[PDB]
Amino acid sequence: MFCSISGETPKEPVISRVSGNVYEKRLIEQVIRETSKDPVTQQECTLEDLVPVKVPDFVRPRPPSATSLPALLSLFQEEWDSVALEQFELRRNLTETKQELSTALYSLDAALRVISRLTKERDEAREALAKF
Amino acid sequence: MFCSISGETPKEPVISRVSGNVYEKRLIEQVIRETSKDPVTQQECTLEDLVPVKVPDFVRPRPPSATSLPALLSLFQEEWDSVALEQFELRRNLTETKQELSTALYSLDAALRVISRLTKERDEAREALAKFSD
Amino acid sequence: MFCSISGETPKEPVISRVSGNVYEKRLIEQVIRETSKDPVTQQECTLEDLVPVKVPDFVRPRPPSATSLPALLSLFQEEWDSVALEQFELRRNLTETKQELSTALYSLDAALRVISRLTKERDEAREALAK
Amino acid sequence: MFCSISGETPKEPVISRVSGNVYEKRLIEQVIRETSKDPVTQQECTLEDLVPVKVPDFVRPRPPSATSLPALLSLFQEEWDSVALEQFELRRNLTETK
Amino acid sequence: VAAGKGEKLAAIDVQRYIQLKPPGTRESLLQSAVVWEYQKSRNDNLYLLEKHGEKAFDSSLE
């Protein structure tokens, strides 16, 4: 919708075959007449390499929305990858939580064994105090 | 805005060289898989015949209620039925148009026979008028 | 070919120059669009840090027998059920790890208190032994 | 699924950044040790260029079950594409017959 | 399917996810969980829609 040569929109857009770009008829024919080169990609171009618009055709269009089956299937896979991305993030969180859970698990088991051994020592010390 | 094959809006439209028309990649690829040619021109075509061009893409605005949910499956069934009914209408249109074409062609051939016969009667009638004048 | 992201076989594996790891180009590009930083090293990442690579494609199961084919909804229901179960288990993991953290806090606190008990009782016993 | 040097199935997928081709880690290492250049374009190759050891960790790999969503998704897309092709062919035939 | 629906015969699929079955067997749990997940996805999609407003609609009309 923008022409690189002049910066203005093309009234009659034309697509160059050599390099995909949208030009306007007057300026593109000027640059073709002055030389056989592409003003952007500095490559050989001709009159036939310019492609006018053949939009009309004969077939029946659709609304550009999510109400057509290619579009609707695009929304299908969008829903699917959205719930997939949610599963990805939550599974990262699950594995991180599993790692820290295991760390806390062995820390707590060691702490419980320490508590048991200590309480044994303290029962011994209480017996030693009571020996008198 | 509409792919020339189904009318679908091509998010990635292409243009050809023998006949530049807006086409969608997947459908021309499946046509090449079926027949390695272009039925539009009855000519050989390759994968490179399309050129990926730049388009702003067609924004796809969502209806009041399209947020996943069984709305999406109801739309699945509805568009199934809709494209299939379009297919039925178009097939029966084939059958009606061909039968009407055959009837019209028969009437046209009979018209040709009768115009020839009537033209011959003109020739004898004109000659009869001219020969009465003596 | 063991993809570190979900476990599913990646049809487009990629390599990283700084730290080669199995991802997919589209997903890493989308994440960089969200946050243009390296997730592991916490460093800035650009779009040119990945090198193109070729892939040999895979096969599809293509379910036959074409009978009104409504099973898609049941598979969808199963997918949301699975994600809901996994969310519940996220909740359970968080709760259990916090409970363990709290239990560890008081276990170490009790260790301190009981070691104060030990040192005082041992001092008492040794002093009375000296007496 | 085969190497370009020996032909056996490569258990360790490795590829050079400089040149895009399928190789094997042991053979490419032997080539580098013999000559410190790429055999194709005569470009330098280092250890960090190669693919490092594979890292399967925290993956819990569910086997690739047959019954799955992508098959139905692709089937529906291929169906619609074929039926739309049929609509095009017969709309052209319809305009011709009209 | 064409020989089927040549007499309309509208194909049927389950829309019974709004009845909100009262406390029962596991089916009630399944419906509640799937409805919760549908609700979360609906939240995300509609808030995403109102992030940008109707600029896309203006472009479609233009």
UniProtKB/Swiss-Prot annotation, chain A:
Compartments it resides in: Nucleus
Domain of life: Eukaryota
Domain U-box: 1-71
Entry's family note: Belongs to the WD repeat PRP19 family.
Functional note: Probable ubiquitin-protein ligase involved in pre-mRNA splicing. May also function in DNA repair.
Subunit (UniProt): Homotetramer. Component of the NTC complex (or PRP19-associated complex), composed of at least CEF1, CLF1, ISY1, NTC20, SNT309, SYF1, SYF2, and PRP19.
Record's protein name: Pre-mRNA-processing factor 19
Region of the whole protein represented: 1 to 132 of 488
Curated annotation (Swiss-Prot), chain B:
Residue stretches making up the U-box domain: 1-71
Subcellular location: Nucleus
Subunit text: Homotetramer. Component of the NTC complex (or PRP19-associated complex), composed of at least CEF1, CLF1, ISY1, NTC20, SNT309, SYF1, SYF2, and PRP19.
Family indicated by similarity: Belongs to the WD repeat PRP19 family.
Cited function: Probable ubiquitin-protein ligase involved in pre-mRNA splicing. May also function in DNA repair.
Protein name (record): Pre-mRNA-processing factor 19
Shown residues in whole-protein numbering: 1 to 134 of 488
Swiss-Prot record, chain C:
Cellular compartments annotated: Nucleus
Top-rank lineage group of the source organism: Eukaryota
Family assignment from sequence similarity: Belongs to the WD repeat PRP19 family.
Positions of the U-box domain: 1-71
Protein name listed in UniProt: Pre-mRNA-processing factor 19
Quaternary structure (record): Homotetramer. Component of the NTC complex (or PRP19-associated complex), composed of at least CEF1, CLF1, ISY1, NTC20, SNT309, SYF1, SYF2, and PRP19.
Job of this protein: Probable ubiquitin-protein ligase involved in pre-mRNA splicing. May also function in DNA repair.
Curated annotation (Swiss-Prot), chain E:
Signal peptide: none
Organism domain of life: Eukaryota
Compartments in which it is found: Nucleus
Subunit structure and binding partners: Belongs to the 40S cdc5-associated complex (or cwf complex), a spliceosome sub-complex reminiscent of a late-stage spliceosome composed of the U2, U5 and U6 snRNAs and at least brr2, cdc5, cwf2/prp3, cwf3/syf1, cwf4/syf3, cwf5/ecm2, spp42/cwf6, cwf7/spf27, cwf8, cwf9, cwf10, cwf11, cwf12, prp45/cwf13, cwf14, cwf15, cwf16, cwf17, cwf18, cwf19, cwf20, cwf21, cwf22, cwf23, cwf24, cwf25, cwf26, cyp7/cwf27, cwf28, cwf29/ist3, lea1, msl1, prp5/cwf1, prp10, prp12/sap130, prp17, prp22, sap61, sap62, sap114, sap145, slu7, smb1, smd1, smd3, smf1, smg1 and syf2.
Biological function: Involved in mRNA splicing.
UniProt similarity note: Belongs to the SPF27 family.
Protein name, as recorded: Pre-mRNA-splicing factor cwf7
Species: Schizosaccharomyces pombe (strain 972 / ATCC 24843) (Fission yeast)
